Design a protein around this nucleic acid. Structure first.
Lengths: 207, 120, 120, 114, 53
RNA sequence: GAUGUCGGCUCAUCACAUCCUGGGGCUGAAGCCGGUCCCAAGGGUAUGGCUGUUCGCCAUUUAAAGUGGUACGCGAGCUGGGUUUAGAACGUCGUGAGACAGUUCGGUCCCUAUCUGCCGUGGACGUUUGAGAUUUGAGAGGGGCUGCUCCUAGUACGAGAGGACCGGAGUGGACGAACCUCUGGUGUUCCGGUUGUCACGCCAGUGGCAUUGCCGGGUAGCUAUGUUCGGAAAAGAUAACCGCUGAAAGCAUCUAAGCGGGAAACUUGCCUCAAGAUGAGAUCUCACUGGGAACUUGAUUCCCCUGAAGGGCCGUCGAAGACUACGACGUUGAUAGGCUGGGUGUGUAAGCGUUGUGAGGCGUUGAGCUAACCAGUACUAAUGGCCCGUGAGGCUUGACC
RNA sequence: CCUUGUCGGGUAAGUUCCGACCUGCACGAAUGGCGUAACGAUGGCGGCGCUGUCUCCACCCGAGACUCAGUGAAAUUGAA
RNA sequence: CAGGUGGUCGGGUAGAGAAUACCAAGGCGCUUGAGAGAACUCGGGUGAAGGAACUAGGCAAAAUGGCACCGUAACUUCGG
RNA sequence: AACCCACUCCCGUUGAAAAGGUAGGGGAUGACUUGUGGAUCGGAGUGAAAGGCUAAUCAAGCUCGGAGAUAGCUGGUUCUC
RNA sequence: GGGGAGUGAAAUAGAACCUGAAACCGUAUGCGUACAAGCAGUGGGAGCCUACUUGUUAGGUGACUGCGUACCUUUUGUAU
């Protein structure tokens, strides 16, 4: 089980002992369970959830009919969490109160999208010399293979292309503050993506 | 100082006036050394009679950088000039006086002799 | 990468753009209906709309400020007398942009950009 | 929403910070704690740069100890900065005052106001 | 870098299976009854039931 | 009827005959270190001074600076120092033109990628009625490094000297991912100063041009040198190795049946992609309920009948982007611009009171912008077309009707 | 040639360099010998200053690339 | 067709100047444009901390740059 | 500076250009640069000398003849049984 | 530049003018083709579609499948 929120900024906490903690905050408007999938009906155990606010003209009849089974009046997106053995009713409401302090938490967002990057900014390649007579190959890559053998480029070769908007998961980030009144997690460090991007928070996979 | 070929003043008492880093010690491809780190120097310039001579491969602790050192609140402390304190093979200072300030990142178990002599 | 960056380059230098968007703005306060390019009209209203807002407060420090960023005497007196007494209770949106087909020579997308309360 | 992260910052911002400008000579009372004690250490010098970003606000003060120039960029609302006190106000007509770095002893003197 | 073999006309025409043109979004003024591009001024100068030029 | 050198650079990929890290046997292995031989290819595996160098010799590192194959990998990726065409010189050889187990200075490196390959990103179609959304995971990729202090313990060990394995922290390095709160960088879209000059009628004030004329700063964004996080533990099956029971072979033997322990290798674990996985899967919801004719009865085509769910075009845009696609929104609207505050940056504008012979001196004042930043909305621009998609979804068999 | 001879200096380290030695494979006195101020877009070395040369690249500004409109090539090609 | 082509004239402010910057008289917008603001390429701008660690080699870039006055080494063929 | 040159970098190499451009660079009262007219030519001129130059050609120009040179070499040689 | 009308024996003899071939480029129609690897054919062969007459035909297409590395020249030998 986890929670769906939004990257609401990047802040700092000063402690009394004098250390500023790098903080991003994740505002989590109370999620609402939509469908509870069991093995008897779906093969695996999971719970659909929905983070609120979607205008009626943007909700389709099929989508609107699904929020209607669960009396939810649901908003933007639907997300699913693989459960081990938890039981959620299909009208319940999961909040930040599912996390405490300390707590190591993994955060998965959509990384910030760099357009089409080169081999230097995408794969950390070393640029060639800028003057010792170098021709027009300043940041172009070097050779892409050996010679007649293998006589082709191998699959996976590191080249340039969409460096960017990819699902990225940051793990083991400590939870410095759980605010159930303003519906906030304050997480120590950086989380992937831009401000307001939808972001998934759940218990650390490595403990 | 920070890297090799870098040239840096001498904050302790006797011998050199300028030393040049010829190796940053520590790791393997290690490329930088800040305050509290151990470099390998050579003596580029020295006084007429002192405990070191010009042209001598020695070891020195970095005490005072222009890149600076950062505190836990986020604050930085940043100096105008690069400076080291030369050491022996005990990694104990050779001179008996320290000139200029140092930082509190240097009052560890090995370098508190430099701190206790410094007019910080 | 231009994340959250404002302003079109329009394939000319920064001093050319500043010359063009005050030639365009001065032409628009004179004629009140000019036919220009569609990206070039979207960038006009970030120049010509703050000149009318400025000319709603008739003042000697506003008339020689509008003259600093129009450098035309005729279109400062067309402001501060007409456009600023028309638009005194209109909170922005002094000009509308109406797309009108494509240019014939190249295939440039045209627009009409037009002040809202024209007498006609 | 920026309204809820500027409200997290406003909760931490209940410390005084008297008014001081670049050019002024100030005494920062810093806390030191290592080798466990809680004593207070002065850092007197010239404010050369202010950052004015709310909780993220900062200032850079320039001192010279023992013939060595030395900068601390402070964090204005950190609890390391215990208190602040302006010694003499300066007359500089410039915001970031980094030209003092090339001046040594008497060219690096600020005028006073009033 | 050149061909070692000329392209077949089967493959020459497979390439240009993506080069077919698209149509414009046209619509009719309710007042005048003339076709114009959607979201554009009419070729007589009408836009949403009003002469603008 | 051309397959263009050596080396460096950039990028690699495989091998194991292993340089480091991991597991072991034997030792002429007390310990600390080693020697030697097995097992092991997961990840790591210098920087410079000389030289055209490969190497090599040296300086200082490191846990370690492995050995090979790949046209002595790689010039339609780079260089062009060596060799090296035309010039020139030195030594030598020849009467000479000229030559070289030789030296020395100088000396043009072309190609817009069709096909295969590769990195990206789409269009079509198919998934058996169509659709909005959420997923299972067959398979595939990434990742996998390590030093130091301390704590056990100067304890085991050793006459002493010297010094542990085995166990848990917390601090680095190199590497990778994210990020921009901080420290900074940039910021030709912001604010100042200032030189020369031309102009705005002139004075003031400003504006063009001079690399942004030159410069001081500097918002947002992007960024590293900044910040945060990572590599696991764990499980299973093993490798050498160590066995337990135990015959063949009254005994002995890890083995022939049977049962185990056992490594960074292998399989999961962690991360990402993933039903074009044509074996095209699964859930939840949604939407569509008229007839004649020939001819051969998946029966189809034809007309009349209507076009839903939804999708798309278009428009306003985006922290999404080469085009796309993806995402948000289109008046039942807050998507962009403006406007209204708030912030930020710059640093006390203009005008006039004031002041001196003049250059120049306080307040208003710590102002107007406002760039990208943060805050409501009917100021402006996002227009209730019919373009697509239809009219209940074949047959056979079986179970329950 | 052996050869990076040997020794001294310069560097942390110097096959180059400087000064020597003479064991001149294979210097030598108008195919001139050995010096030499001034000179040089001359060859080799070393230092200061200066720096994106580099560690290691980051951002920015213009011209192409990409897109749309118009015009419209080339080398190559047995067939695919 | 960024090339070449003898000679003549030559205003203003700054300036030694016919250099150069900005302008007058005079001439001109260089006969494809519009967007967009990826990699990469080109010509530039700024750069933390280092400062030749680059490389065959400081190649390139950065730096120096005027006038007056002071001061100025070895060596010299007495001019430098 | 003009002017004449052409040392270096990069771009350009299907170029804007069958040798340029941009940024720097050498000479710049002289053995200088240049206009116009003239003189010398193919085993022949001219050359501060490189086999350089003699109309984008030079270890012997271009053109037309000997001439369909010669080629022990290359390539090709066409309907059927 | 065409669509007619006229002219002529004929205008698909209309001046780029008799005939008007081939490469090359089109439109219409029938069949094939989006899970299948390579000289592109050949042997086998279903279905579908046209004409006809009986069917044991004729034309088109060719799912699926067996075998299958062009041609010249030169050579001891070339898919090369």
């Amino acid at each position: 089980i986890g929670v769906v929120g939004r990257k609401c900024g990047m802040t700092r906490i000063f402690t009394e002992e004098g250390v500023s903690i790098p903080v991003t905050v994740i505002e989590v408007e109370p999620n609402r369970v939509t469908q509870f999938k069991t093995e008897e009906t779906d093969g695996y155990r999971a719970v659909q959830v929905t983070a609120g606010e979607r205008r009626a003209s943007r909700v389709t009849k099929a989508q609107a009919g699904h929020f209607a089974k669960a009396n939810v009046a649901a908003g933007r997106g639907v997300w699913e969490f693989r459960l081990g053995e938890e039981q959620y009713a299909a009208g319940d409401q999961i909040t930040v109160d599912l996390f405490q302090a300390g707590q190591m938490v993994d955060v998965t967002g959509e990384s910030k999208g760099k357009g089409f990057a080169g081999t230097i900014k995408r794969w950390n390649f070393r640029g060639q010399d800028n003057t010792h007579g170098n021709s027009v190959s300043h940041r172009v890559p070097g050779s892409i293979g050996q010679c007649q053998t293998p006589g082709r480029v191998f699959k996976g070769k590191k080249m340039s292309g969409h460096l960017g908007a990819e699902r990225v998961t940051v793990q083991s980030l400590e939870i410095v503050r759980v605010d159930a009144e303003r519906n906030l997690l304050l997480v120590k460090g950086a989380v992937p993506g831009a401000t307001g991007g939808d972001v998934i928070v759940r218990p650390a996979a490595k403990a | 100082m920070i890297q090799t070929q870098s040239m840096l003043d001498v904050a302790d008492n006797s011998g050199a006036r300028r030393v040049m880093c010829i190796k940053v010690l520590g790791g393997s491809h290690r490329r930088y050394a800040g305050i509290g780190d151990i470099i390998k120097v050579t003596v580029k310039e020295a006084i007429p009679r002192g405990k070191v001579k010009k042209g001598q491969v020695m070891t020195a602790v970095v005490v005072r950088t222009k890149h600076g050192v950062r505190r836990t609140d986020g604050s930085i402390i940043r100096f105008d000039g690069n400076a080291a304190v030369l050491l022996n093979n005990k990694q104990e200072p050779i001179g008996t006086r320290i000139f200029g300030p140092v930082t509190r990142e240097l009052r560890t178990e090995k370098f508190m002799k430099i701190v206790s002599l410094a007019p910080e | 990468m231009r994340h959250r960056k404002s302003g079109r380059h329009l394939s000319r230098t920064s001093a050319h753009r500043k010359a063009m968007f005050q030639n365009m703005a001065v032409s628009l306060f004179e004629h009140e209906l000019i036919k220009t390019t569609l990206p070039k009209a979207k960038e006009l209203r970030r120049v010509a709309e703050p000149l009318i807002t400025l000319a709603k407060e008739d003042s000697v420090a506003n008339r020689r400020l509008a003259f600093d960023r129009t450098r035309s005497k005729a279109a400062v007196g067309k402001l501060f007398n007409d456009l600023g007494k028309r638009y005194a209770n209109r909170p922005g949106g002094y000009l509308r942009i109406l797309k009108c087909g494509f240019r014939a020579g190249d295939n440039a997308p045209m627009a009409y950009v037009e002040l809202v309360d024209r007498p006609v | 929403t920026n309204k809820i992260i500027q409200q997290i910052e406003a909760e931490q911002m209940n410390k005084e910070i008297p008014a001081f400008a670049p050019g002024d000579t100030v005494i920062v009372q810093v806390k030191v704690k290592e080798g466990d004690r809680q004593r207070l250490q002065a850092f007197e010098g010239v404010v050369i740069a202010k950052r004015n970003r709310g909780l993220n606000s900062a200032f850079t003060v320039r001192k010279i100890s023992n013939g060595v120039g030395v900068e601390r960029t402070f964090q204005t609302y950190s609890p390391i900065v215990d208190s602040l006190s302006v010694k003499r106000r300066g007359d500089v007509r410039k915001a970031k005052l980094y030209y003092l770095r090339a001046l040594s002893g008497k060219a690096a003197r600020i005028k006073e106001k009033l | 870098a050149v061909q070692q073999n000329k392209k077949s006309r089967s493959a020459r025409d497979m390439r240009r299976s993506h080069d077919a043109l698209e149509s414009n979004a046209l619509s009719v003024e309710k007042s005048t009854g003339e076709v114009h591009l959607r979201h554009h001024v009419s070729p007589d100068g009408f836009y949403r039931g009003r002469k603008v030029v």
